[PDB]
Design a protein around this nucleic acid. Structure first.
Lengths: 82, 119, 57, 47, 137, 94, 175
RNA sequence: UCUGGUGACUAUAGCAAGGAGGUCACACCUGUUCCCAUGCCGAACACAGAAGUUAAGCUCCUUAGCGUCGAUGGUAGUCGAACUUACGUUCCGCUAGAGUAGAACGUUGCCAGGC
RNA sequence: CUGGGGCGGUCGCCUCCUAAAAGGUAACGGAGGCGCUCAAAGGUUCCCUCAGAAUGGUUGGAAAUCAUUCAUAGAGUGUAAA
RNA sequence: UAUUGGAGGUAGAGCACUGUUUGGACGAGGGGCCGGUUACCGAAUUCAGACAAACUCCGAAUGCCAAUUAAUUU
């Protein structure tokens, strides 16, 4: 088994299950996380809030819709009619 | 060499930075203020539909007269309050435009609170 | 402004043209309390600004 | 940096805990906080 | 055309050698040129060597442009070692060629001389080649 | 400068496009002022003769149906290995 | 106010037809002057800041401001935010009386040749002159001072470029 | 469509260059007595005014020089299949990016006075 | 644990790539950090915009400070990286 | 599976950023010298080229999440 040859990079962290958590078109209850992120890949929109961890959660019950903000950003919305 | 500017562009940069939380709904509409070198305007607007529900200005002949500008603001505020009470608007969100709440904008605000608008 | 120091438009009444069109913190005794110029010190007493230039001597 | 326990100068209760540096603040850090016994904001001190 | 003066990361995943030339498929600087028809990794010692051959023949007459630069480093493990224990150290610098890539350009010299020079370069080189002229029309 | 061309149809698959090229025919399109986006194909050997006859730029008569279109080459595609022309773009001046 | 009177009787008069302008709002007007002391090596000193702090509040009539260093510089000890220099801004009548009190004191002490200044510019209309405390003080003698520096000054004008700063150098000065 | 507010839209919306203009609205302006204005400036900010002035900010019109938008067709890649061990081949879908034509010197709700 | 043991290295956390455009994913694979710090580097209210570059200059090691038009942030964000 | 709606940055491309690079313009700094000239050399600024797991102005195929909903199955 070789001998003394050793490497200084065998370390990593535990991945965080970030990304999307709900899709366009499903009924989310209020509080449902829609998109765990870092920084702002998606800003909150209508009836959506920003956690301390940049998490996005619905304010109220309703359907979820991802949309465009300006030329190159995205927000999120929730609408209650159900 | 330096270039002087009109004070409105800067005003409307700060405007966008305050309109960020202040948005008029039907229940709680937004009262804007547009101060000119000689006049002051005011509109009650629901931003959820983009409709002005009431308006008043120092040019409006009912209010136009000879005063100290702070004094006609005290009249623009009073008028906006009346027009809103007719439509049924009690609670409003005062948007100070991008003007420091002081002098004229203050005068107008105080005047609307002293006449009815609950803000 | 605010706590700004003193500076007054004094009459620099020099013997060379009496160029009393200056100002300063030279709040000295008004030896010449004139009215055409400031009733202040003629703190300028002798100079060549109005008398001897290297170009216009 | 050291841990700190803040106690109600009225009640006496050690109600809160936090952290201070013993060189930057070499004193009993004092701060108004809620004594849930007295239902109010009394001054709290490190001890 | 030997080595990159500095690279950020020096032990890089080896290059893909499957597909077609991303670019450099035309004579831009020269009059006659030389493109490849297979793919191989071309090392710095081979480029240097094909160059000396080409330019000895032209007898310092006309100009040359090398179109391939050895960017990728490659590693080789030390001799008689077992599997594992890290990645080896850099042994040379390479630049992948794939069918189509022009490897050498020439100008300011007659056509037959250029063809002979590029021929002599082709044999010091590990990839099948082809003689080409400045595309026009 | 009197080249002709034949019209191709919708949905020419990969196989159809690659077979044309084996029969010595190159595919092309025309556009610009005075016409619409018509997709045509021309015989390669012939096109080359016209280009060496007129050069890079030339107000060329182009045969489509019955109408001749004053047209010049906007720009073109080539296969460096297996020397063969691939797609010609044409703009009309008129 | 003194040169302001001159302006509205002579500069407005002469400059208005020296170059053709339609309105009188198209006319070059001096806006202000920044009087930054510049930089003296107060790394081991902190007293010379006050020599200059008291110089400027006496030279002009207003307390100066010590703009500390922006970036951290080697050679001299200027760490991020080292206090150095002092820049006063003259906007109102003071711009005028102080300007006047400059031409009316320049010749005795400047000891200049052809004209006081020449092509000392930045190319766009500003002076960038640096006087080693020569003409500056009638009010207070060289006798009560200790350090030597060059007060840096430029010209803030509605004018366009230094070519125009020359025609407004015909404002009593010496081009 | 004027003119000034105030939403809405991926700059097709913008930058520049040129040309106009003031319909009393806008500015620039003119001052510090006041509320106020600071650190470091009446600049700004606030305020009190209107003698001025279209000069600029602004608005309207021109122009694709720049930025932006951008197909058709072809190409690369690739899902599936059938060959096959080739730095592969074929068939069938999907189908870029770059580039080319071109688009484009914005539309636009509401409110108030205009006409 | 270990491409047989031994010797050398490693062991828990965070970041990145490998990772095949959800998530996840291994090797003694490729790179780095952590075992803290801040009574303001926290809360809130009101204000303000940057690095560099030349048209440059009292200094000018060049660029210290100061000036002026461009600066899409090329700067800053207590620290590793995203 | 058919039809909508969406998150994400791989293949491919590209050089707008971090870099890595080959030729050609163009003026200039320490410096060949007397601050110097000219060569250059360290870059500024361009035009044409290219390279990338830990580059991205871009960006598929397919996978994945879900639907007012259909059709076939279990």
């Amino acid at each position: 088994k070789k001998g003394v040859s050793s490497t200084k990079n065998g370390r990593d962290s535990e991945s965080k299950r970030l990304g999307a958590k709900r899709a366009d078109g499903q009924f989310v209850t209020g509080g449902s996380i829609l998109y765990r992120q870092r920084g702002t890949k998606i800003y909150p929109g209508e009836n959506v809030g920003r956690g301390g961890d940049d998490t996005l959660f619905a304010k109220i019950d309703g359907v979820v819709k991802f949309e465009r903000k300006g030329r190159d950003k995205k927000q999120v919305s929730v609408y209650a009619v159900a | 060499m330096i270039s002087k500017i009109d004070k409105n562009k800067v005003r409307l940069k700060r405007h966008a930075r305050v309109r960020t939380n202040l948005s008029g709904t039907a229940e709680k509409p937004r009262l804007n203020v547009y101060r000119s070198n000689k006049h002051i305007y005011a509109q009650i607007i629901d931003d959820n539909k983009g409709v002005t529900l009431a308006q008043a200005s120092s040019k409006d002949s009912d209010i136009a007269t000879t005063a100290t500008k702070v004094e006609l603001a005290t009249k623009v505020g009073e008028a906006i309050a009346k027009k809103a009470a007719d439509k049924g608007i009690k609670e409003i969100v005062f948007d100070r435009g991008g003007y420091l709440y002081h002098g004229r904008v203050k005068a107008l605000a105080e005047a609307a609170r002293e006449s009815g608008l609950e803000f | 402004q605010g706590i700004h120091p003193e500076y007054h438009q004094v009459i620099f009444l020099d013997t060379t043209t009496n160029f009393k069109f200056l100002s300063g913190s030279t709040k000295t005794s008004s030896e010449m309390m004139e009215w055409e110029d400031g009733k202040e010190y003629p703190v300028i007493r002798l100079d060549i600004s109005s008398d001897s230039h290297p170009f216009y001597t | 940096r050291v841990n700190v326990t803040l106690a109600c100068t009225e009640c006496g209760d050690r109600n809160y805990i936090t952290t201070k540096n013993k060189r930057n603040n070499p004193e009993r850090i004092e701060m108004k906080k809620y004594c849930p016994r007295l239902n109010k904001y009394t001054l709290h001190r490190e001890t | 055309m030997l080595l990159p003066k500095r690279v950020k990361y020096r032990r890089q995943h080896r290059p893909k050698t499957t597909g077609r030339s991303k670019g450099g498929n035309y004579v831009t600087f020269g009059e006659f040129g030389l493109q490849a028809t297979t793919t191989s990794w071309i090392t710095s010692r081979q480029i240097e060597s094909a160059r000396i051959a080409m330019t000895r023949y032209m007898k310092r007459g006309g100009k040359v442009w090398i179109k391939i630069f050895p960017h990728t480093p490659y590693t080789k493990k030390p001799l008689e070692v077992r599997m594992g224990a890290g990645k080896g150290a850099v042994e040379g610098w390479i630049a992948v060629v794939k069918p189509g890539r022009i490897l050498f350009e020439v100008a300011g010299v007659s056509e037959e001389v250029a063809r002979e020079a590029l021929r002599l370069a082709s044999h010091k080189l590990p990839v099948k080649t082809k003689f080409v002229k400045r595309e026009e029309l | 400068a009197s080249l002709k061309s034949i019209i191709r149809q919708g949905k020419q698959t990969r196989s159809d496009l690659k077979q044309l090229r084996k029969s010595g025919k190159v595919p092309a399109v025309v556009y610009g002022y005075g016409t619409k986006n018509v997709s045509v194909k021309v015989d390669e050997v012939e096109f080359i003769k016209v280009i060496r006859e007129v050069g890079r730029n030339g107000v060329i008569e182009l045969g489509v149906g019955s109408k001749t279109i004053k047209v010049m080459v906007a720009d073109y595609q080539f296969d460096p290995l297996k020397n063969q022309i691939t797609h010609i773009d044409f703009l009309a001046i008129n | 106010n003194r040169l302001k009177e001159k302006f509205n009787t002579e500069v407005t008069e002469n400059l208005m037809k020296k170059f053709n302008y339609s309105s009188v709002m198209e006319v070059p007007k001096i806006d202000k002057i920044v009087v930054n002391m510049g930089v003296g090596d107060a790394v081991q000193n902190s007293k010379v800041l006050d020599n200059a702090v008291e110089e400027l509040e006496l030279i002009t009539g207003q307390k100066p401001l010590v703009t500390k260093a922006k970036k951290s510089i080697a050679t001299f000890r200027l760490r991020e935010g080292m206090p150095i220099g002092a820049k006063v801004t003259l906007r109102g009548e003071r711009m005028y009386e102080f300007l006047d009190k400059l031409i009316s004191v320049s010749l005795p002490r400047v000891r200049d040749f052809q004209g006081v200044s020449k092509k000392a510019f930045d190319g766009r209309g500003n002076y960038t002159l640096g006087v080693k405390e020569q003409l500056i003080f009638p009010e207070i003698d060289y006798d009560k001072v200790s350090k030597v520096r060059g007060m840096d000054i430029v010209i803030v004008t509605t004018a366009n470029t230094d070519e125009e700063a020359r025609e407004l150098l015909a404002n009593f000065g010496m081009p």
